[PDB]
Amino acid sequence: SMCMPCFTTRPDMAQQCRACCKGRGKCFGPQCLCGYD
């Protein structure tokens, strides 16, 4: 599953997704997925 949602209107979304994923994760549409660069 996803770590959290990715929200279009958060300009720091990538950073929040990486916080969620302990430094390694990426937004794919509305989903923060850990283990992707």
Contact 20, 34 (CB under 8 A): yes
Tell me the technique behind this structure: X-ray
β-strand 4-5 against 31-34: which pairing, if any?
A: antiparallel
The answer to whether residues 32 and 25 touch, using CB atoms and an 8 Å cutoff, is yes
Which run of H or of E encompasses 4?
Answer: strand 4-5
- DSSP secondary structure string for all residues of 16-37: HHHHHTTT-EEEETTEEEET--
What are the Cα distances from residue 11, in Å, to 1, 6, 15, 18, 28? 23, 10, 9, 13, 15
- For 30, the token pair is 């509305």
The experimental resolution of this structure, in angstroms, equals 2.2
CB 14 within 8 Å of CB 37: no
